[PDB]
Amino acid sequence: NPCCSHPCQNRGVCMSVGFDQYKCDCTRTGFYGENCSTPEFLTRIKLFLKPTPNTVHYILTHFKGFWNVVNNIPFLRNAIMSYVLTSRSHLIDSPPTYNADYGYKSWEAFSNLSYYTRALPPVPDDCPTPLGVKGKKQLPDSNEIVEKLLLRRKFIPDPQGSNMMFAFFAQHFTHQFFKTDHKRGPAFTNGLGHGVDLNHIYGETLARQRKLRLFKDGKMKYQIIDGEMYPPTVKDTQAEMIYPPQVPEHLRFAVGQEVFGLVPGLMMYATIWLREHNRVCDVLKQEHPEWGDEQLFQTSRLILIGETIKIVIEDYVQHLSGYHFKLKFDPELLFNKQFQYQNRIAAEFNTLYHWHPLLPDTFQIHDQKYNYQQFIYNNSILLEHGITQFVESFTRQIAGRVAGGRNVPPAVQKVSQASIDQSRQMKYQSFNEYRKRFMLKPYESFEELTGEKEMSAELEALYGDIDAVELYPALLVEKPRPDAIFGETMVEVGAPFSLKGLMGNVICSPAYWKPSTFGGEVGFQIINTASIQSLICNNVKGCPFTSFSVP
Amino acid sequence: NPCCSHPCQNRGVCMSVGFDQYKCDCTRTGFYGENCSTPEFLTRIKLFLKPTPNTVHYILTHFKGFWNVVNNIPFLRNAIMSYVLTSRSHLIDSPPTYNADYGYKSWEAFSNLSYYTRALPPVPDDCPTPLGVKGKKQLPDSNEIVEKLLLRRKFIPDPQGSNMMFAFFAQHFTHQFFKTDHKRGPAFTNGLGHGVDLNHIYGETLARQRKLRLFKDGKMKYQIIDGEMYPPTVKDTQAEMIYPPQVPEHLRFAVGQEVFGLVPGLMMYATIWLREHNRVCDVLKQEHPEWGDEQLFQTSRLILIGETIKIVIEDYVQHLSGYHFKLKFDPELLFNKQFQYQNRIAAEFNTLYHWHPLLPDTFQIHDQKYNYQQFIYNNSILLEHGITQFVESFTRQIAGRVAGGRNVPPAVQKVSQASIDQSRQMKYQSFNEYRKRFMLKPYESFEELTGEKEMSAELEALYGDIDAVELYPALLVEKPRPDAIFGETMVEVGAPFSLKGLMGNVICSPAYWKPSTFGGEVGFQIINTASIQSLICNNVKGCPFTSFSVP
Ligand SMILES: *[C@@H]1O[C@H](CO)[C@@H](O[C@@H]2O[C@H](CO)[C@@H](O[C@H]3O[C@H](CO[C@H]4O[C@H](CO)[C@@H](O)[C@H](O)[C@@H]4O)[C@@H](O)[C@H](O)[C@@H]3O)[C@H](O)[C@H]2NC(C)=O)[C@H](O)[C@H]1NC(C)=O
Ligand SMILES: *[C@@H]1O[C@H](CO)[C@@H](O[C@@H]2O[C@H](CO)[C@@H](O[C@H]3O[C@H](CO[C@H]4O[C@H](CO)[C@@H](O)[C@H](O)[C@@H]4O)[C@@H](O)[C@H](O)[C@@H]3O)[C@H](O)[C@H]2NC(C)=O)[C@H](O)[C@H]1NC(C)=O
Ligand code: COH
Ligand code: COH
Ligand SMILES: CCCCCCCCO[C@@H]1O[C@H](CO)[C@@H](O)[C@H](O)[C@H]1O
Ligand SMILES: Cc1ccc(Cl)c(Nc2ccccc2C(=O)O)c1Cl
């Protein structure tokens, strides 16, 4: 296949013409020529006036005195936030295009929701090398890559101070749209909503939802233990959950997501959100005594969705970005813009979000310290200590650094390898191709990627060519930004995926973004004043202080 | 329920506040006040400059010499067509809101694709009257409505000259997204693509598609009969079709849509589009001898989708409108506008497209006249005459006028009654409520609606109040425009749904609307030069003259 070398630059579409020739479609790329590499006049100018991401990142992470002024001038904050949203939006194809089985546009790829979509097309089948034309005939041994480059020798804490509240929020939140269907294969998903629908609370299907609902006051089923509200059982709901035989019947908590019983950190947030839903039902009941159970349930769901997006932007992304600028969740910022209120989850977004290095060596709850074997599938620990003690402890324990290499816990060594192996059967293009796909300069050397000497040497011994380095491994060994959890690429690729999934949500559209949608101003206000602190304060006994970073 | 009165005007959202009070959400309506009835300053002006639809219709259907010059100046033609598209589209909620089960915004209503969506929410369950407050406690007998107002005494031909080519095209085309799942109920659909995906050619599911495909050269299965290409059999494809047991196996043609064997007219268009698909495969193979079966199939499908939208706008809607202005299919007209490339089929769109009056008393092919009992499920008629004779004959046979009342063939009486019964199951608001929803002044009397005395009287005897008249019966008895097939409402309500369904298609989005999407410029040119005449000329022996109007 002549398109194996990925000849078309700047988002140009490559098409074969006969057996030995190809053609590049430069339509609306701002470039022309055989490979869409010659800039148009207007393009030369725009390229000359674009700051580098590292320049812009510097600006947003310094001058705290300046940003403190900007954050308190609504007009400016709105203007800045508007830029942040729109300056990235042009990097996501919407409606979506390719998937694992289609490197050309097709109705199958567009219409079949069981697939993850793809930011870059899959490497064609019969190519000289797995990645196209660069690199060796065979990719390096995946286990060898994990051990030499990814495995933790000594715990590397996150310099930004991200804690376990953050790490488990990241996992809980993203696992509502990262639901890989490993029956079919890594290219397929079970989250047909393809975004923030809160299916991990309410269930992916109506059948599961009816098993989880109380059908009184709009609320979700629950049980009281030691005066505290917890999720219901599988026995009570008949809602299937993933549990080992060793887990007794009365400890098989049923929640929206079948796998959230795997780890107590997930069951903590599931409990918190469950409580929040029933709390909002009580508020709405007070406001609307004429409302029935169905409308109480549906309106509460729409509110929690709003809370979720609110919290993710203004607390979660806020902490992750390290910006002194105060991010703002406000759908009105897009009402005068060209924006598509739809989204399809990208397989690469999933891959890049394998933040295994976040995980500590042991989990520390109160006085106790649990290893992975003791912590996994253990709702006893949740009942023993309680949510309050969980929050206090998770807020204090720091997470591991994601970029910079060699920080993956040996306990999840198999999962790290799987991420590499699964990236290969989905035929991912190289790291540098994804750099270019998101307006970044390709690395010219291994040393430029890692910013050090020995890991880069290992990469060269394994891959040989810098253009042969794979997406997932490179993201984890990439040179971090100064005192940051990530490197340049992780942010520049992830941010557009993330913002698209948040602002693209239907509740953000002008027809939905109204008080009547959420039951009136009281309901609308719950969204617009939501925070990770208030979420905990409203639903966790004692109202403990919490944050996404260690104090 | 205080909202039974439909108090909120101008797209305002009604919400109950306690048992006896309500509240209107006037957000972004352009109006304010308790009822969203008081216009803002800009709105006050906008309404003043906006011409009435009857005026605009007059200007587009007269001054034939003036439009002749506008049509040949691309700057003017593009600008006008652009306004046509945008001015209509703002009347459609996208992403979609209500369905038959939800008169308030809910995630269930948004996410469940099995429902038709709703331009107006259902009438609340427990209201004084079926339509809310207006009208009698019980709606008139649906059979009495059909007999008095809708049944055809004597055939009334369409003044616009619509022929059977047009009638069967309307039926064939619209039945890809009007696929009511009566198993579940009238509120539900089997077309989860919710638009122009040509599932009626290729099948809804991948399983049925694989049954119809040849898996060589990207082609669809077929058989040759008298030198001419026809659809394959059920026995060969194992694709389910709906046929009475008395139909012999060799006459059981298998096509994408299960019901198209019902009438030869549909099976005619199914055969033509089948031929076109296999024709485009031959064209693409010449351009791409390096391509495989899968890519040839998928690319052909995308091209036929383009042809359909092209033909619908510049031939079908062009004839239907009666405009002297030449409508244009050009996705680039929207690339600088705010527009959502998504759509959800509205139940009301389905209802207003029950154009039963189009049907003739008998079907006239060559020298023979077939009644309904003769014509239904009779594919032997198709083979006897051939597609060419079908095209020649149907082009010449006049269709019935749709508006004006009393033109529904008694043969389909029970179908017309079902339209009324079903719309009542789904709790449609009144005809006047749908007029106001689409910026039309509500009718003051029955006489203003029909423009005459006889049907007016029978209407008042049945409904009592003008605000009690139902959508479907009113559309068919409405005073038709001068020498036109429809009345005002049908167009002003139908056109937004239609254009949104056409331009909202994914292939019209900037990422898709490129030559590379369609296999290069040769494929792209197939779309952009498509017409109903070229579709016939390329696939029907002898290249017979055809048109959507009688010669
Ligand atoms: C879009 O909306 C449609 C209309 O609301 C949804 O269709 C409806 O789906 C529900 C649930 O799938 C279905 O109700 C069925 O619920 C009963 C379930 O209870 C039984 O299930 C357990 C299973 O182990 C069993 O032990 C017991 O028998 C327990 O009682 C079914 O048993 C029963 O047959 C009933 O049909 C509705 O019938 C169905 N409605 C229609 C009109 O089709 C549709 O699911 C939704 N689409 C989504 C959410 O994707
Ligand atoms: C999105 O894409 C997915 C991947 O392409 C689609 O999943 C695939 O779906 C097909 C069928 O829907 C499935 O094929 C399976 O069908 C075989 C049966 O074939 C014969 O068997 C019956 C027996 O009665 C016969 O009557 C039929 O006529 C037919 O000739 C199975 O035996 C076999 O297991 C085979 O796998 C694929 O497995 C499946 N692939 C994956 C990876 O899941 C998915 O359907 C699509 N989503 C849509 C269209 O909504
Ligand atoms: C912040 C990100 C994050 C965290 C904290 C986290 C925390 C933990 C954790 C904590 C105790 C455990 C035991 C695991 C273990 C697993 N994770 Co994650 N995971 C994370 C991101 C992901 C993602 C993303 C996937 C793929 C999701 C999918 O496709 O369903 C994943 C998949 C897995 C799988 C599937 C294996 C496979 O073959 O793909 C296992 C097992 N893991 N992970
Ligand atoms: C231009 C529009 C048009 C035409 C010419 C047309 C011509 C014909 C025709 C010609 C020989 C026949 C035998 C019928 C007979 C039927 N029509 Co139509 N129909 C049309 C638009 C529709 C639509 C739209 C529906 C509802 C489709 C759905 O919900 O799936 C429909 C429904 C039906 C049904 C379903 C039963 C019911 O309860 O509604 C039958 C039977 N009919 N119609
Ligand atoms: C958890 C400990 C990981 C064991 C890694 C075994 C594979 C050898 O890994 C080696 O380890 C050395 C010391 O870290 C590095 O300096 C080398 O670059 C690396 O290749
Ligand atoms: C605008 C901006 C800036 C910095 C980060 Cl870290 C993000 N967010 C992410 C970056 C990389 C990967 C994931 C995310 C995320 O939002 O989840 C955003 Cl959206």
Ligand SMILES: Cc1ccc(Cl)c(Nc2ccccc2C(=O)O)c1Cl
């Ligand atoms: C712009 C315009 C003008 C006139 C008609 Cl008739 C249409 N088309 C329809 C009008 C009413 C009902 C249906 C349609 C249609 O396109 O099918 C359009 Cl889109």
Ligand SMILES: *[C@@H]1O[C@H](CO)[C@@H](O)[C@H](O)[C@H]1NC(C)=O
């Ligand atoms: C870019 O075009 C040149 C000739 O214009 C060609 O030799 C080269 O192969 C193209 N790029 C790639 C990566 O092949």
Ligand SMILES: *[C@@H]1O[C@H](CO)[C@@H](O)[C@H](O)[C@H]1NC(C)=O
């Ligand atoms: C849960 O933790 C307890 C400690 O209280 C331990 O004894 C038990 O083995 C664990 N159960 C698991 C991991 O299933």
Ligand SMILES: *[C@@H]1O[C@H](CO)[C@@H](O)[C@H](O)[C@H]1NC(C)=O
């Ligand atoms: C608004 O309309 C409702 C319709 O029933 C009416 O009861 C009410 O008096 C109106 N209020 C106004 C016009 O202020």
Ligand SMILES: *[C@@H]1O[C@H](CO)[C@@H](O)[C@H](O)[C@H]1NC(C)=O
């Ligand atoms: C079907 O049409 C044929 C002519 O092609 C005719 O002989 C036959 O009687 C028709 N069938 C019915 C049931 O009328």
